[PDB]
Amino acid sequence: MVQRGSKVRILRKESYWYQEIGTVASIDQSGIKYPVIVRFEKVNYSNVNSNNFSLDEVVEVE
Amino acid sequence: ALYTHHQYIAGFLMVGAFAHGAIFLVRDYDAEQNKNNVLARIIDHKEAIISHLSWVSLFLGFHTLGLYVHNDVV
Amino acid sequence: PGDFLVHHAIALGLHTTTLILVKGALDARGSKLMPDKKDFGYSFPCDGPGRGGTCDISAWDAFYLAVFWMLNTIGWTTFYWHWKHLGVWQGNVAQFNESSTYLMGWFRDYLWLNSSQLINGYNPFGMNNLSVWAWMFLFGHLIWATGF
Amino acid sequence: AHTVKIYDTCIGCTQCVRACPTDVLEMVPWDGCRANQIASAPRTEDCVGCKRCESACPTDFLSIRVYLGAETTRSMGLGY
Amino acid sequence: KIVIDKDPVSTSFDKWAVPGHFSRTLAKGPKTTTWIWNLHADVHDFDSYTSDLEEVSRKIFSAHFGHLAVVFIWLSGAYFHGARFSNYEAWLSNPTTIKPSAQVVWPIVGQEILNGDVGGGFQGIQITSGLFQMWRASGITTELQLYVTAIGALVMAALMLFAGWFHYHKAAPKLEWFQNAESMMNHHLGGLFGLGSLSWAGHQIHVSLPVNKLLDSGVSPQEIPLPHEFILNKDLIAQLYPSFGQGLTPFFTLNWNEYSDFLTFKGGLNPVTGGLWLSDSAHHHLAIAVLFIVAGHMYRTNWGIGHSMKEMYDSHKGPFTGEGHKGVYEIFTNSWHAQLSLNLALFGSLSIIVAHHMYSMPPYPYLATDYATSLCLFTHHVWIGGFLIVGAGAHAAIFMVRDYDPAQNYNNLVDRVLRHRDAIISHLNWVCIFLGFHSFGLYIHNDTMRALGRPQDMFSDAAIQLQPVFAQWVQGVNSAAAGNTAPNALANASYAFGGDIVSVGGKVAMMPISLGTADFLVHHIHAFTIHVTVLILLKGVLFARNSRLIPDKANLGFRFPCDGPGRGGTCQVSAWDHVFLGLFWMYNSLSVVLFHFSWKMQSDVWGNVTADGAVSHITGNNFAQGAITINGWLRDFLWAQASQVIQSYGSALSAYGLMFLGAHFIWAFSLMFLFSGRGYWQELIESIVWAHNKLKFAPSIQPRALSITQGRAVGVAHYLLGGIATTWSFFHARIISVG
Amino acid sequence: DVAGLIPCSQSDAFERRLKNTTQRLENRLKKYEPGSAPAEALQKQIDKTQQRFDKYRNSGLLCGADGLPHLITDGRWSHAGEFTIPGLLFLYIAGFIGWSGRSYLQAVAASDNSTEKEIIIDIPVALQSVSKGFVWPLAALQEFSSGKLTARDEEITISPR
Amino acid sequence: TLNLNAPTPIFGGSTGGLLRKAEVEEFYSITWTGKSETVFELPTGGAAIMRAGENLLRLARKEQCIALGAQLKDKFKITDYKIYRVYPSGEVQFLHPKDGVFPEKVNPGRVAVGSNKRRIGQNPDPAKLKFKGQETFDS
Numbered sequence A: 001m002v003q004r005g006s007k008v009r010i011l012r013k014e015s016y017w018y019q020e021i022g023t024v025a026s027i028d029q030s031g032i033k034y035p036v037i038v039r040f041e042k043v044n045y046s047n048v049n050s051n052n053f054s055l056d057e058v059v060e061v062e
Numbered sequence B: 001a002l003y004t005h006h007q008y009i010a011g012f013l014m015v016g017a018f019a020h021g022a023i024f025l026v027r028d029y030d031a032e033q034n035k036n037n038v039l040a041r042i043i044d045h046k047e048a049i050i051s052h053l054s055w056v057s058l059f060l061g062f063h064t065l066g067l068y069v070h071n072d073v074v
Numbered sequence C: 001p002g003d004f005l006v007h008h009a010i011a012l013g014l015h016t017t018t019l020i021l022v023k024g025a026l027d028a029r030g031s032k033l034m035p036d037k038k039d040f041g042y043s044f045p046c047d048g049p050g051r052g053g054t055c056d057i058s059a060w061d062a063f064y065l066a067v068f069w070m071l072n073t074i075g076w077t078t079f080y081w082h083w084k085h086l087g088v089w090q091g092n093v094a095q096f097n098e099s100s101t102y103l104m105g106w107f108r109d110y111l112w113l114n115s116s117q118l119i120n121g122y123n124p125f126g127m128n129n130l131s132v133w134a135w136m137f138l139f140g141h142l143i144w145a146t147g148f
Numbered sequence D: 001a002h003t004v005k006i007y008d009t010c011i012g013c014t015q016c017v018r019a020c021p022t023d024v025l026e027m028v029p030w031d032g033c034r035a036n037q038i039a040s041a042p043r044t045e046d047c048v049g050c051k052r053c054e055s056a057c058p059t060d061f062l063s064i065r066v067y068l069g070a071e072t073t074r075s076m077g078l079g080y
Numbered sequence E: 001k002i003v004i005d006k007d008p009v010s011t012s013f014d015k016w017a018v019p020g021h022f023s024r025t026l027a028k029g030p031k032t033t034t035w036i037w038n039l040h041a042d043v044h045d046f047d048s049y050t051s052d053l054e055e056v057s058r059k060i061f062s063a064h065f066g067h068l069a070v071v072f073i074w075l076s077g078a079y080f081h082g083a084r085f086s087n088y089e090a091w092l093s094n095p096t097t098i099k100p101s102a103q104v105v106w107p108i109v110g111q112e113i114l115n116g117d118v119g120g121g122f123q124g125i126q127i128t129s130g131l132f133q134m135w136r137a138s139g140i141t142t143e144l145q146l147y148v149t150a151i152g153a154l155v156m157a158a159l160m161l162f163a164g165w166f167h168y169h170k171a172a173p174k175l176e177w178f179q180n181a182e183s184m185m186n187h188h189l190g191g192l193f194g195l196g197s198l199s200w201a202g203h204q205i206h207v208s209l210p211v212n213k214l215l216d217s218g219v220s221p222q223e224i225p226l227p228h229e230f231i232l233n234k235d236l237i238a239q240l241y242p243s244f245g246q247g248l249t250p251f252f253t254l255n256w257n258e259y260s261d262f263l264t265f266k267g268g269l270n271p272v273t274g275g276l277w278l279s280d281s282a283h284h285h286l287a288i289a290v291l292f293i294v295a296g297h298m299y300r301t302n303w304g305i306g307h308s309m310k311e312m313y314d315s316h317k318g319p320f321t322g323e324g325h326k327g328v329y330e331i332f333t334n335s336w337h338a339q340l341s342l343n344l345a346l347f348g349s350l351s352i353i354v355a356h357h358m359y360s361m362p363p364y365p366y367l368a369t370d371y372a373t374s375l376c377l378f379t380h381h382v383w384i385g386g387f388l389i390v391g392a393g394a395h396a397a398i399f400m401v402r403d404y405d406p407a408q409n410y411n412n413l414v415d416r417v418l419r420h421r422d423a424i425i426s427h428l429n430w431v432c433i434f435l436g437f438h439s440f441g442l443y444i445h446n447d448t449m450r451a452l453g454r455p456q457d458m459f460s461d462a463a464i465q466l467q468p469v470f471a472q473w474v475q476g477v478n479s480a481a482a483g484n485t486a487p488n489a490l491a492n493a494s495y496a497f498g499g500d501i502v503s504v505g506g507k508v509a510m511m512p513i514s515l516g517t518a519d520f521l522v523h524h525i526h527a528f529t530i531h532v533t534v535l536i537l538l539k540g541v542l543f544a545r546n547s548r549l550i551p552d553k554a555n556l557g558f559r560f561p562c563d564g565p566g567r568g569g570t571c572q573v574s575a576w577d578h579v580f581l582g583l584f585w586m587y588n589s590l591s592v593v594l595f596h597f598s599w600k601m602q603s604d605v606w607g608n609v610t611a612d613g614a615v616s617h618i619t620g621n622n623f624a625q626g627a628i629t630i631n632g633w634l635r636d637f638l639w640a641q642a643s644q645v646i647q648s649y650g651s652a653l654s655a656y657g658l659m660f661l662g663a664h665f666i667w668a669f670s671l672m673f674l675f676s677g678r679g680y681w682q683e684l685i686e687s688i689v690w691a692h693n694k695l696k697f698a699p700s701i702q703p704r705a706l707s708i709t710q711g712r713a714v715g716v717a718h719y720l721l722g723g724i725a726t727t728w729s730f731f732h733a734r735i736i737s738v739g
Numbered sequence F: 001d002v003a004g005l006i007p008c009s010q011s012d013a014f015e016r017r018l019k020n021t022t023q024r025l026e027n028r029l030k031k032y033e034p035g036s037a038p039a040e041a042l043q044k045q046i047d048k049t050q051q052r053f054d055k056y057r058n059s060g061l062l063c064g065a066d067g068l069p070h071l072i073t074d075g076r077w078s079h080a081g082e083f084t085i086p087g088l089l090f091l092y093i094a095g096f097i098g099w100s101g102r103s104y105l106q107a108v109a110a111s112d113n114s115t116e117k118e119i120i121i122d123i124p125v126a127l128q129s130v131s132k133g134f135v136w137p138l139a140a141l142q143e144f145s146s147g148k149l150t151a152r153d154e155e156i157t158i159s160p161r
Numbered sequence G: 001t002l003n004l005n006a007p008t009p010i011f012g013g014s015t016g017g018l019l020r021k022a023e024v025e026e027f028y029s030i031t032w033t034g035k036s037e038t039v040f041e042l043p044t045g046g047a048a049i050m051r052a053g054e055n056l057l058r059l060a061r062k063e064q065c066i067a068l069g070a071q072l073k074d075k076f077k078i079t080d081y082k083i084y085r086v087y088p089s090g091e092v093q094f095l096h097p098k099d100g101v102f103p104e105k106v107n108p109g110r111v112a113v114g115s116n117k118r119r120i121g122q123n124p125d126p127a128k129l130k131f132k133g134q135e136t137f138d139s
């Protein structure tokens, strides 16, 4: 279980920020798949900084 | 004409060697079946091979060009 | 010392051509730009203008850039074979000795000095048996420039 | 026709639909939640393959993909 | 009506800190490295971020002051280096023998071998800019007059630079001060062009003509009185052309015939120098002034009399063309780009007209015998002119994307050209293919005929003749025109059409450039290469908004790389990419014009004259039978005349040899950007960010590959720089040695 | 004498390059006025030539049949000043510029706006990294031993497999 | 329906439109009501004038209809554009709005065509689907 503000590492192998550190901005309090919103320092090639991940793709390195 | 014949073919054969290995990796390679062998380890540190090939390309070309431009100007 | 500088140009060519060829070999299955490059095949143009624009991204186009590099590497190789032997065969080894150390002697004393009797294959006073080569010389310039 | 497949990491952002120049895409309600949406491509025969729907998807490595298949007269974008 | 605003912009350094301050897209910080190139791309494009035409035009006005500053700064350096570091004083005593020179090179690592034996007791770089011949025609005899002019340009440079600060930060004019085109046309015609040619006509009479009358009598540059003595001492202006003793009473009483000795119509070349007669050019700009001052009283202002350009276009409409020119005035007083493109078209079209009128009618004394300068003066202004014509097709395309309004343009002359553009482009498409076959294929035929031992089947002068009869006739009506249809002129408009050989020193100043079978071929190569250059640029203009392929190409922009790989692939569809492709074709077109010029003159025109009168030219009349085949273009021009740019190592011409090979590099380096694409490098950089992220020091400004539009731009920039600077080095090292 | 290369003090082809370089400048001097300003710039050029032939004769270089000084990199200590000694002199200077820009970026990245400080360079932090850059052959030794010179591969981003 | 005949805008021009492809198979027509007599750019060349209308325009491509249908929603705010594709020498009537509403708006009763119940990193290798009729993205 990840909470907001927690510094996570992404295990989604397709992501631009795979195996990189980001801070969770929020989690969605419903049963929606991919609820974990992580904000990253580094922008991807579409110059965005957020994505929706699941709890299986993140860890709790804090 | 005989040296220049086979060397230009050898370049075309050596480029086509890496070309058909590259076709193997899209079509025929299966990373769930091929794991922990020599093949699935070279893919595992492929950034280490390209960047160290990015150095020796850039190490020679910075210097043997500058060694020529030195000898030109001088 | 002239043979020193060419072998490191050659070693630059074999390393760079390998660099392009093992780039698209190992990155044929995905990168941070296009992670699903195995879903699109070996030969496909691009993934559009999105994600910064992905021209020449495929594993086919890494072959395609290294064909310029092998022609240049064998071009470095066989220019060095030919001009070294053009002084060996003519008995004047000193022309490759002093002029090959700097790139103007490579230009003046190989491409300019030796292409004189070729380029007089057909002058306005006659023609020789080299006029099939002087034609195919210019024929080769025209087809090369058309690829541009 | 080019194949357009929409993956489940879509968020109902509606951005790829309004960036389509040939009106291929549309929004549809989702089964398991019945509140959020997803894009859908019921008119893939109209798809020219411009990949403008991938330039508008906000998810990291976009939820809608375009695979350039066989080229008909519509997908070639021919006025003749 | 002058209307301004008082202090709209403060003079602060708060925005000097932040780069990218002007736009909402920038100044947030570079998250990637494209921002470093996004900043330098859209700075001087004021129209994008600022959405007020009043604010946009104030930026444009005060910026030309900054460009006026850098020209004056550059002009002072032309005058300072002629004052300090030149042999201008020794050159006036012997102008044929001594080579013109400035730019002494410092005694460091070996570049003091470039300070060569250039003439007299001076050592420096033999320059090819013609400033020595321009300052002699201006009358300058000592270096003090050059030194004060270098100071005079720097105070003028500060004057323009202060005026750009003042007219944006302090007193910026409103929009209505800029939209007054009739008062602007009135002022620039009579004031800038008329008084500028009236006041320069004053210099050529009082200053240039007296000192040159003694210089062509050949006394000394020291014995000649200073040019203020020709204003003060009226006895001194009476011993040479004694019509100054009557004052301005021939002028006001219309008895202008008394000025028949310093306002002539002699019209030839000076037999002592080989330049135009200065009394012709004195009479010239005086006649140009009155035509320009009178024409500046044409357009209407706040005094009722005068033409209105809005009502000349209304009721200039025919039955073919619908609503006529109705709307082109309102387009031209609102679009800054349509004003830019048209003023760029006829600035670059003029710059080639300047080149053609200056080798054949050499305006300056000892410019014609200076073959080292007359070729570089031709090849410069041709090259300057072709860049500006590509900027015409560029900025006409930027007009179409955001300044074109369909509501203002219904059935006018912009609408009706955008409605039959498929008829314009395809008929332009055919006439290139017709000209490419029937001009280049006549070289391919002549290659194949001379290769196969069939010299009687090619197109030559001793073969199937293609004589240029429409140009040889015009050579006849202009060589026999002095005395019959221009009866007051003593000699012809030029010696290029027909006339004697003017021989100044031992060398030809000018001689009749004949036209033959080869000249038919190259002038149709020129007709072909221009028509393709038009075809790429005009396709970019007419299809800048839409096509059958992309119907919303103006919604995507003037400068975007592609609409994707769909519709078969839509790479290089935008209006910017046609400007990018036309740059090579402009490079392709102009480089043949300069190859045509450099060998036409060396074989048929330029050369030496013996003591009897026979001419021996430079390359020895080999343009007639050599320049009809591509092999003769390779063997007798590019191989035979680059024998001075490569045998120049170890001599004073060595920096031409180094610029030769050094520009072959940058040309060939450009193909790395042109032939390849971006998405290779963006995954190659992903291996280099890894090898920097491994040692924990990867930069926070994330490295990106150059964009698709930038990679095209950085490849065309090094392409032109690589080939022009090769042609720069080949031309300079050749004609300095033989001419 | 390592590859048939005679030393340049007894190499006659090298001593003949001097005879033709000054003869190509004395004939360049023979036409000018003797007290003039281009005359003294050629004698400054003639004597600059004599200061490179006497500099290469006494340095013990190896001249071939052409008469030009050849360099010998296998590194021998009798020929150590060709590549080994300026190569060591190179490697400290390049590693100084290398470790300075690496120490600058690690300090800047743990701040509020890291990308801002790459554009406008903080002269405190820039001159700090010069102080941390002069000690780099010592500083990298305890940096590599501490484990914080490199990163493990679970911390770097990496393309999909 | 298409309501042909409907008045063409007052145009008279455009080489660039509706050539021989239209008479054999598949041309398109966009129909709208323009609430003025104002000028608008065509995808062919630029002007016509929109009628009071019932305005109709026969275009060559569907891509040219949505480009014009975007201009009427942008510049004139007339979003009532209703494109078609013709009969016997054409294919399919009533192309847009396909379900009585714009595709960016949600409408129940639509079915998710081309949906995938997986991510893109969960796509199989092509070697697993080699020598089969399955493709590496279809489900």
Ligand code: CLA
Pocket (backbone or CB within 6 Å): B012, B013, B015, B016, B017, B019, B020, B023, C042, C043, C060, C063
């Ligand atoms: C014996 C070795 C060998 C074999 C069996 C193959 C076989 C194959 N290759 Mg490989 N390849 C080879 C060597 C080989 N290649 C070499 C030496 C290179 C480097 C040059 C390559 C680089 C390569 C690439 C990049 C690709 C292949 C592909 C293929 C596959 C399809 C080829 C095809 O249909 O193209 C059709 C054939 C042509 C279009 C031939 C035209 C090109 C020639 C060179 C034109 C010659 C110019 C002209 C005639 C000269 C005139 C003279 C002048 C004086 C006028 C097939 C499996 C493709 C594939 O997808 O694999 C699954 C593919 O993308 N090959």
Ligand code: CLA
Pocket (backbone or CB within 6 Å): E009, E010, E011, E012, E013, E014, E015, E016, E017, E022, E058, E059, E060, E062, E063, E065, E066, E067, E070, E161, E162, E163, E164, E165, E168, E169
């Ligand atoms: C000297 C005092 C001074 C000061 C403090 C300012 C301050 C300002 N000016 Mg002003 N201005 C000045 C004089 C001054 N100006 C002058 C002399 C001119 C006439 C050129 C102008 C005309 C002007 C315009 C049109 C605009 C400004 C603007 C500005 C504001 C932002 C500019 C900026 O931050 O970029 C600083 C820019 C630079 C440091 C680059 C200067 C480039 C110079 C002029 C030419 C360099 C080319 C040179 C020849 C190099 C060739 C290549 C080289 C390799 C050889 C800032 C308040 C902008 C503004 O107010 O936006 C709302 C704006 O649009 N100024």
Ligand code: CLA
Pocket (backbone or CB within 6 Å): C142, C145, C146, C147, C148, E429, E430, E432, E433, E434, E435, E436, E437, E440, E441, E444, E532, E535, E536, E581, E582, E584, E585
């Ligand atoms: C030297 C290389 C080269 C050649 C031959 C061409 C040729 C052409 N370009 Mg291309 N172009 C080039 C470089 C070249 N370009 C480069 C480097 C670029 C990138 C900037 C471009 C970008 C470009 C643009 C943007 C455009 C062109 C266009 C054209 C065509 C002009 C129409 C014409 O007059 O054809 C005449 C044909 C010739 C001069 C070829 C000579 C061949 C002889 C006469 C006939 C052949 C002999 C024989 C019959 C062969 C058949 C026998 C065989 C089958 C057995 C022509 C095909 C334009 C176009 O297509 O508009 C119509 C156009 O708009 N090109």
Ligand SMILES: CC1=C(/C=C/C(C)=C/C=C/C(C)=C/C=C/C=C(C)/C=C/C=C(C)/C=C/C2=C(C)CCCC2(C)C)C(C)(C)CCC1
Pocket (backbone or CB within 6 Å): B017, B018, B020, B021, B022, B024, B025, C022, C025
């Ligand atoms: C001198 C001498 C010697 C030595 C020799 C040696 C030892 C050699 C080696 C050699 C070698 C060392 C070689 C190698 C080569 C290699 C190559 C040729 C490579 C290539 C590769 C490739 C091309 C790959 C590809 C691929 C990929 C990429 C992926 C997957 C698939 C494949 C695998 C296909 C001796 C002892 C005898 C004695 C004395 C003399």
Ligand SMILES: CC1=C(/C=C/C(C)=C/C=C/C(C)=C\C=C\C=C(C)\C=C\C=C(C)\C=C\C2=C(C)CCCC2(C)C)C(C)(C)CCC1
Pocket (backbone or CB within 6 Å): E695, F073, F074, F075, F083, F084, F094, F095, F096, F098, F099, F102, F140
């Ligand atoms: C002596 C000699 C020689 C030899 C040499 C050799 C052979 C070497 C090798 C070496 C090697 C084989 C090495 C490699 C290495 C490896 C690695 C692994 C590396 C690493 C590195 C790093 C990691 C980096 C760091 C840094 C620095 C150091 C500085 C700056 C900063 C930086 C961070 C960049 C010769 C004969 C030539 C010559 C004579 C002398």
Ligand SMILES: CC1=C(C/C=C(\C)CCC[C@H](C)CCC[C@H](C)CCCC(C)C)C(=O)c2ccccc2C1=O
Pocket (backbone or CB within 6 Å): E672, E673, E674, E676, E677, E678, E681, E704, E705, E706, E707, E708, E710, E711, E712
């Ligand atoms: C080589 C190449 C690149 C790679 C080139 C890049 C990334 C440019 C980077 C090179 C410059 C020189 C980096 C400059 C870095 C610093 C500014 C250096 C500062 C040094 C100071 C001392 C001045 C592309 O991105 C590309 C894209 C599209 C088509 C072709 C190409 C292409 O050919």
Ligand code: SF4
Pocket (backbone or CB within 6 Å): D006, D007, D009, D010, D011, D012, D013, D014, D015, D016, D017, D038, D039, D053, D056, D057, D058, D059, D062, D063, D064
């Ligand atoms: S484009 Fe992709 S991310 Fe955006 S709404 Fe459509 S499916 Fe979702």
Ligand code: SF4
Pocket (backbone or CB within 6 Å): C045, C046, C047, C048, C049, C053, C054, C055, C056, E561, E562, E563, E564, E565, E569, E570, E571, E572, E708
């Ligand atoms: S430039 Fe990029 S988007 Fe355009 S066609 Fe090429 S690969 Fe596709």
